[PDB]
From Swiss-Prot, chain A:
Result of altering K60E: In vestibular schwannoma
Outcome of substituting L27R: In vestibular schwannoma; loss of ability to interact with the CUL4A-RBX1-DDB1-VprBP/DCAF1 E3 ubiquitin-protein ligase complex
Domain FERM, chain residue ranges per copy: 3-259
Reported modifications of this chain: Ubiquitinated by the CUL4A-RBX1-DDB1-DCAF1/VprBP E3 ubiquitin-protein ligase complex for ubiquitination and subsequent proteasome-dependent degradation.
Organism: Homo sapiens
UniProt name for this protein: Merlin
Residues of the full protein shown: 20 to 312 of 595
Designated gene of the protein: NF2
């Protein structure tokens, strides 16, 4: 009737009883409901095929099975978009790991400022009738509930202004065979020199892209403006190319919703 | 340092690395932060000594170690008090288990209503039925993504479940076997409203009720409890409980429920 699934969040190693005939969406929505999470479009269940990132399909049946509950997509504006504390918390921990691992470049002042908010996010600080009265008074102060962790939001507001924040990088080659990087993020598609992940050479905002097409390892970005040339590029791995397109669709659509 | 702690919820398991010198409050607040839970006063970390329910102390150091994250206290009004969905969800699962186990008596009509809301709470949330790339393919994959990714709705069916459940006489009552000074075998009910004395052959309607606002004090000394009412016309109620671990639990539930009762009356 059910089988055990290990779900790893940034917080904990969790275990769920997944029904035999359940699809990816049923397992995913169980995890979300467990964490009281409604802002679910950011998240997915990740695993690795060979050495590539893979995200669990929501329409396929799920079949110690292990997935990582992670953000696939990032907000453009953390304060406006992360309304629930759980979403703020999960983003905070994922972004902080990327800061500490130096996956996101961070300048010295931002480093010490982020570190200070992380410190604040880490730390929140017989019976006689007379004993009954003392135990009444003591209980009120001891049981008032957790305050919302505003430091986590202050952290994300600094982090989101970093050039490398929420950018997915992929090694690519243009039609001349020049090695470059592709950045897929909230704002659009970006082409980088391989030795500068901070400042793109070219940017294609999602509103300025007529279409993207993919055939036989070649991507084509068709801009909305006919004065701007089409950008064709190559990526060698097919499993990586499927991931790029997944991130293009999601980020495009979340971009459009943010513009009402 | 650290040691592994298993935290079992109502339908999931989570493992945490608990620091050696950490107190119960450190471990408890880590679990609450993991679930994004701020309405924490309802909850505790439960374990069992011999066959009795025990709750982990927040000032004592924590020392496969397993605790159950459960509600120790119940709201008087679920809709008003369970503002966060997580709190609603955790109460829904705990109360549903008590309904299905028949720990809370439920009449047949309420039971089939509860079962219908449980179906809707299970899937209605995200499923309204309740259980190469060409430029043209790019356009189709854009349009398909919007409908496929809408977010989870607040699981309102759970609140509807709790609103039916909270009107059941046995809901949120902690029962304890007790004897009065004449030696009559009776039950003590500890709940959000006060203390209740039951005939053992009727857990639904109490013989005597002492509302928390109408209790001057409670005292306990060596197996015997004393309820002193506020009104001097009402006699003091003395009763006996045989098990010492059960008596520590009774007093814990008396203090918490008394204090939550008073906060609700501002």
């Amino acid at each position: 009737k059910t089988f055990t699934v290990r779900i790893v969040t940034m917080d904990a190693e969790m275990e769920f009883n997944c029904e035999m005939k359940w699809k990816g969406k049923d397992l995913f929505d169980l995890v979300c409901r467990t964490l009281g999470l409604r802002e679910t479009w950011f998240f997915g269940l990740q695993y690795t095929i060979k050495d590539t990132v893979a995200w669990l399909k929501m329409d396929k049946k799920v079949l110690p099975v292990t997935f990582h509950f992670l953000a696939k997509f990032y907000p453009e504006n953390a304060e406006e978009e992360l309304v629930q504390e759980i979403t703020q918390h999960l983003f905070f921990l994922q972004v902080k790991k990327q800061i500490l691992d130096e996956k996101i470049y961070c300048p010295p002042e931002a480093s010490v400022l982020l570190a200070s908010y992380a410190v604040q996010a880490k730390y929140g600080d017989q019976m006689t009738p007379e004993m009954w009265e003392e135990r009444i008074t003591a209980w009120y102060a001891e049981h008032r509930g957790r305050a919302r962790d505003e430091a986590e939001m202050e952290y994300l507001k600094i982090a989101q202004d970093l050039e490398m924040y929420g950018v997915n990088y992929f090694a690519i080659r243009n039609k001349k065979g020049t090695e470059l990087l592709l950045g897929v993020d909230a704002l659009g598609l970006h082409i980088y020199d391989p030795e500068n992940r901070l400042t793109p050479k070219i940017s294609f905002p999602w509103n300025e892209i007529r279409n993207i097409s993919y055939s036989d390892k070649e991507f084509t970005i068709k801009p909305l403006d006919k004065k701007i040339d089409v950008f064709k590029f190559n990526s060698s791995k097919l499993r990586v190319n499927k991931l790029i397109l997944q991130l293009c669709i999601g980020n495009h659509d979340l971009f459009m919703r943010r513009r009402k």
